[PDB]
Design a protein around this ligand. Sequence first.
Ligand SMILES: CCN1CCN(c2ccc(NC(=O)CN3Cc4ccc(Cl)cc4[C@H](C(=O)Nc4cncc5ccccc45)C3)cc2)CC1
Ligand SMILES: CCN1CCN(c2ccc(NC(=O)CN3Cc4ccc(Cl)cc4[C@H](C(=O)Nc4cncc5ccccc45)C3)cc2)CC1
Ligand SMILES: [Cl-]
Lengths: 306, 305
Amino acid sequence: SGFRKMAFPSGKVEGCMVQVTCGTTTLNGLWLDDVVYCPRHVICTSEDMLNPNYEDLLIRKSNHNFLVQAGNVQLRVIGHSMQNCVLKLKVDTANPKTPKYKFVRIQPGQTFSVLACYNGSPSGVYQCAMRPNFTIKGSFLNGSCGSVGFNIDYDCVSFCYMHHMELPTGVHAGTDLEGNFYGPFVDRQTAQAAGTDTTITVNVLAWLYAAVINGDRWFLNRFTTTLNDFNLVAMKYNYEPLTQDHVDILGPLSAQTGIAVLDMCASLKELLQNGMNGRTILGSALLEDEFTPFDVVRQCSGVTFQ
Amino acid sequence: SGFRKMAFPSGKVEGCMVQVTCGTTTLNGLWLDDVVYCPRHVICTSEDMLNPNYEDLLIRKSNHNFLVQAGNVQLRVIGHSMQNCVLKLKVDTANPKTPKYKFVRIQPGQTFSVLACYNGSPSGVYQCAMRPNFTIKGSFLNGSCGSVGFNIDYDCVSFCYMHHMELPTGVHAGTDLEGNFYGPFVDRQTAQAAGTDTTITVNVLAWLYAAVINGDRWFLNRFTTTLNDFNLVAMKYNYEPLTQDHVDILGPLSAQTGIAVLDMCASLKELLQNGMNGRTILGSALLEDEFTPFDVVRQCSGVTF
Ligand SMILES: CCN1CCN(c2ccc(NC(=O)CN3Cc4ccc(Cl)cc4[C@H](C(=O)Nc4cncc5ccccc45)C3)cc2)CC1
Ligand SMILES: CCN1CCN(c2ccc(NC(=O)CN3Cc4ccc(Cl)cc4[C@H](C(=O)Nc4cncc5ccccc45)C3)cc2)CC1
Ligand SMILES: [Cl-]
C-alpha cells in the first residue's frame, strides 16, 4: 500500500554526468560513448545572451577552450559540433559507464525523472511531468543547466530532457537530447513567458484509479457521463480534452477497479463542481496530474530495473 | 526557483542491493563490504510469524541454506549472525561497489530517501519522513522487505532504515541497520497498530520559510506568539509540540528571511484557524511536514526573492 511521487533509480544516469566549463560559464554535460552533450549557451557570456550568433561564437573556440571534468579526471576534447540548441563535444575517451540508451522526444502530459546536478555532481532526483504549456515545474538553481530528464524501460535509459533555463514565473524550459526546445522558447535573454497552463485530465483520472486501488473511494458515485458532456465540463475548468485514446489507455485500470472511465469522469465532474469538502485523496487536497496511467500501473505492480 | 520533494541520487545504494532467499521466502538484502544485511524474518514461514522464536529457527540453519544473488551472480555465504531484528550474512566476496557509508539511527521528523526494491532489483526512489508515531508512509508491495532508507549529505551514504512490514492502516514499520525497530513494533504477526499520528511542526515551519524564500508572503500577519501559547493552540490541531531546540534549529532560516521564529509561529496559528482560502503554498493546498530545516536549506537558494 501507499502512493508516492516516485522517480526511476538514477544510478545509470549518475555515471554519465560531467562538468563542462568554457570561459566564465560552468554547467553540466552528459557523457555517452565518446561525446559530451550540453546546452549550446555554455559558449556565451552574459552580453552574448542578448543577440547570440552561435556559429560566430563557436568558430572562435578551440577544442582546448572546453574543460570537461568527469569526477576528478580531466577529459580531452578532440572535436566539437552543434545540433540545434545542443553542443556535442567529442572526447578522447568513451565513457566506460555508458548504459544502454536512446534519445526520445516526449509529449505534454508524459512524466520523467530529473537528476538535478551542479558542477557535474548529482544532487537530487525528482519526478515531474512535461506540462501542456511545454514547461516543467522543476526545482533548479543557477548551475543546474545541462541536468537531464529520463525514463527507464527494462535496462534502457531513454533521455528526454536537458535543462536550459528558468522562466520569470519560476518554471523551467529545456530541449530534447537532439537540441529541439519543448515549447516556443529560445536560448537567449529576451522577453519570454510560460503560456496559460492546463490540467492533464488523463493523469488526474489515473491518480483517481490509484486512490481507489489504495482504498480511497469516497468520491465514487453511481453516475456515468458521455465523452462529449465530460469535455464541455473539462473546457470550463482549464482541463485538457479527454480523447478516445485516453479512454482506451485507462482500460486496464477500469477493468481492475470495476469503474468505467466515463464512470470516473462523472466522479471528476462532481469533484470540479463541488470541491473535496474538507476531504483529501491520497493525502492531497488538490487533484494530482503528474502520474500517467503507466506510472500508476507500474507503482501498483512493482516493476524493477536492474 | 521551485520546490520539489527531492530524493538523493540512488546509484550508490543500487550497487548494494541483492536478493536473499531462504526456502520459500525471497526478499532484499544490503551488501556492504563482505556482509549482506537483511530482515531476520527471511528465516520464517507464514505460520512462524505469530510467535517466532528466531534463535530456535536460526540454530537449525547452515550457511548453505541462505541463497544470495547479486545481479546474475550467486554469492557464497560463509557465516551468519543475528543482531536484534537483522540477519548479517558473511559472504566470500567484498562488494566492489561499496560506497563510503555509516549506519545512523534517526529521530521522528527526520527525512530520508527510500530505494524500493523487489527480488534484489531497484524499482523506484522516493522521499519520506519518520512520522512522530515511528511509522513511515511508504509505497511498498509484498517482496519489498529489506529495501532501505538513506541520506547522502556529501559523498557518504548514511543508511537509516530497513523495511520490515506493513501495518493494518497501510503504513510501514522497520528498523535501523543495527536491527532495532523504530517505535514499539515487533517482527511478529500480532495485533499491532500505528498510534495516532501528529503533524511535524518544525518541518511545517521550515516549509513556510521555503515559501518566503521563493517569493510568497501572503500567509504572514502582524502578530507574534509566546512559545507556550503557540503549543497550546497547535496541540488542538494534532501538531507536535515545538521545543526550544526546534526554535534554535530554525535560527538560520529566520536570519535569511528576516522573520523571527515566533512570528512565523503566529502565521502558522492563523493558517490552522483560517485554512488557505483557495490559495496554495509552494503548489500545495495542505501544510507540508516532510521537509526538515536542513532539507529547505539544501534545496532553496541562499538569496530570498
Ligand atoms: C519566482 C520568481 N523568480 C522567477 C525566476 N527569476 C529568474 C531571474 C533570473 C534568471 N536568469 C539569470 O539570471 C540568467 N539566466 C539567463 C538565461 C537566458 C537564457 C538561457 Cl537559455 C539560459 C539562461 C540562464 C538560466 O536561465 N539559468 C537558470 C536555470 N535554472 C534555474 C535558474 C535559477 C536562477 C537563475 C538562473 C537559472 C541564466 C532566471 C530566473 C527570479 C524570480
Ligand atoms: C487498509 C488496507 N490494508 C489492507 C491489508 N494490508 C496488509 C498489509 C500487509 C499484509 N501482510 C501479509 O500478507 C504478510 N506479511 C506479514 C508480515 C508480518 C510481520 C512482518 Cl515483520 C513482516 C510481514 C510481511 C510484510 O508485512 N510484508 C510487506 C511489506 N511491505 C508492504 C507489504 C504490502 C502488502 C503485503 C505485504 C507487505 C509479510 C497483509 C495485508 C494493510 C492495509
Ligand atoms: Cl535524526
